[PDB]
Every structure is written in C-alpha cells, then in structure tokens.
Design a protein around this ligand. Structure first.
Ligand code: 97N
Ligand code: 97N
Ligand code: 97N
Ligand code: 97M
Length: 241
C-alpha cells in the first residue's frame, strides 16, 4: 500500500493547534496517480475537516497535478470549495490554490455582534530543497483574500482585502520528522511567526527507511514526493459583517 499520514503541530500565534491528514491512492501507475485526501484539525479554537481528490501526472523530470476539495469548518458551520494546481520537480514544488465559498453569512461563532462566512482568495506556494543537502528546505507563500473585514492574521484586527508573504525554513533530519519556522508579513504591517512540526508516515516505506537521513534525499526527489499531501491552507479564512 502506498500513501501518507501526516500529523502537524504548530504554534505561536493565531493558528495554534494540530491536525491529521491522509493521502490515499486509488489508482497508481508510473505516469499517473489518482488519490483521495482526507483529514481534520483543531486550530484557532475551531474543528475543521477536509475531503478532496486529485490526479498527478508524471514525466521523468516534472509533474502536473490538479485537485478539488471541500472544507468544512464544523465549529462555525462554514463551507468552502477548493481547487488546486501543482507543478513539481526534483527538490522543487509549486502549487496554486483557489478558495471559493459555498456558505452564506450567519451569526458568527467567535465574534459577538458579527456575521461571518468564508473569504474568497488564493495562494501560491513554493517549496524548495537544497539538492546537495536536501534536509534543508525553504518556503515561499503568497496569499490574497477578499472582503471588507477579513481575518487573515486574527479576528481582533480585521482588514480590507488582505495579502501576505511568508518565508520559512525547515529541517528534515530523517524522513519521519520536519521542523520549521514561518515568518509572514502583510497589509497593515501585520507580522507573524509559525513554529511547526510534522510527523510523516510513508505507507510504502519500512520503518528503518523512515528514520535514516539517507532517504531524505529521495523523499525530496520527484519520485520521492509522489504521495506528499496537497499543499494548501486547510483552515478556512473568514470575513465578517
Ligand atoms: C533550518 C532550521 C529550521 C528551524 C527549526 C526550528 C526548530 C524547531 C521548531 C519546532 C517547533 C515545534 C512547535 C511545537 C508544536 C506546538 O506547539 O503545537 C501543538 C499545539 O497543540 C500547541 O498550540
Ligand atoms: C470531495 C471533493 C469533491 C469531489 C469531486 C471529484 C473531482 C475530481 C477528482 C478527480 C477524479 C479522477 C478520476 C480518476 C481517473 C482514473 O483513475 O482512471 C483510471 C484509468 O486510467 C485506468 O486505466
Ligand atoms: C493540470 C494543471 C493545473 C492547472 C489547473 C488550475 C488549478 C488551479 C487554479 C485555481 C486558481 C484560482 C485563482 C483565482 C482566485 C481569484 O481570482 O479570487 C477571486 C477574485 O476575483 C475576487 O475578486
Ligand atoms: C468534509 C467532511 C470530512 C470527511 C470526514 C473526515 C473525518 C475524519 C478524518 C480522519 C478520517 C480517517 C480516514 C481513514 C484513514 C485510512 O484509511 O488510512 C489507513 C491506511 O489504510 C493505513 O494503511
């Protein structure tokens, strides 16, 4: 069996919490992978679950992929459609994600005297790894959301059509674990930091393979990276009214 289970722990401000996500192949060939993705998370005092599917198509030197998602913030009863695109290479992953709401305004879960609903937006994600030393990765994100009063950073400081850029580094001593730090900056001079740790289990790998720095290189190759989780924000950014 092939696929991935990933636990994520993150802190350090507004989106503190944890999550579990699975990538489950249902068709698997050298040239094309079709997969379901499913998971849930408790982050920023909300319980959210996510369900998706996509295809990945491979050439020896690159990969094209698309995916579709439904995101359900159960705490606040907010629903959203997600679409994604992927272009991956050795030591390089690029992704673009659209975020489209499916649920209307209604009494807000966390903010008194407000209504809330998902804010539409997109983001572009880059992840790159040093080929000579692939345990070192960096992380570029640009994200943009729309609405008169959106909470991209927190709900106590609402913002008009906020955008933000994130730079982060991360370290993967053995395939099983990644640690990193993300700095983000936007709109109103808003800043933050996210410290996070991922535990990665690979269904196709023996145990010893997953605790040996030898194999980090290969997780970061294109054929390495075939069962990695889709790269998106699985948290629904909300807007208020
Ligand atoms: C290139 C070097 C990379 C630098 C890495 C920096 C080193 C370590 C970062 C690890 C951060 C761990 C975060 C803890 C998880 C957490 O607290 O969340 C759980 C949640 O329930 C609490 O809210
Ligand atoms: C849950 C989100 C909403 C669901 C919407 C689903 C939308 C898109 C998912 C992608 C569907 C991929 C289809 C698989 C094609 C395939 O395997 O062919 C096998 C064949 O080649 C064997 O010879
Ligand atoms: C197989 C290759 C993958 C290519 C397929 C494409 C995959 C994903 C594309 C999704 C990107 C959507 C970005 C649009 C977001 C947007 O404009 O926000 C609405 C704004 O107007 C509000 O006013
Ligand atoms: C939008 C609605 C969200 C849909 C509900 C989300 C609920 C729970 C998330 C975890 C689910 C567990 C999935 C099963 C894990 C699994 O099958 O992987 C085993 C693997 O076979 C071991 O090899």
């Amino acid at each position: 069996h092939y696929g991935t289970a990933e636990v994520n722990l993150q802190s350090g401000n507004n989106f503190d919490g944890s999550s579990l996500d699975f990538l489950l192949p249902f068709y698997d060939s050298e040239k094309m992978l079709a997969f379901g993705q499913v998971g849930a998370r408790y982050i920023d005092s909300r319980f959210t679950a996510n369900l998706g599917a996509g295809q990945r198509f491979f050439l020896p030197a690159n990969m094209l992929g698309y995916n579709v998602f439904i995101d359900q913030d159960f705490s606040g009863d907010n629903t959203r459609l997600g679409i994604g695109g992927e272009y991956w290479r050795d030591y390089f992953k690029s992704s673009v994600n659209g975020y489209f709401r499916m649920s209307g305004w209604h009494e807000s879960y966390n903010k008194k005297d407000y209504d809330e609903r998902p804010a539409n937006g997109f983001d572009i994600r880059f992840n790159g790894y040093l080929p000579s030393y692939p345990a070192l990765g960096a992380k570029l994100i640009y994200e943009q959301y729309y609405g008169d009063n959106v909470a991209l950073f927190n709900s106590d400081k609402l913002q008009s059509n906020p955008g933000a850029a994130t730079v982060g580094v991360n370290y993967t001593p053995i395939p099983l674990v990644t640690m990193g730090i993300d700095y983000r900056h936007g709109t109103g001079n808003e800043n933050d930091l996210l410290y996070s740790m991922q535990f990665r289990y690979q269904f196709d790998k023996s145990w010893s393979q997953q605790i040996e720095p030898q194999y980090v290189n290969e997780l970061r190759t294109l054929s390495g990276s075939r069962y990695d989780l889709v790269q998106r924000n699985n948290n629904i950014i909300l807007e208020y009214k």
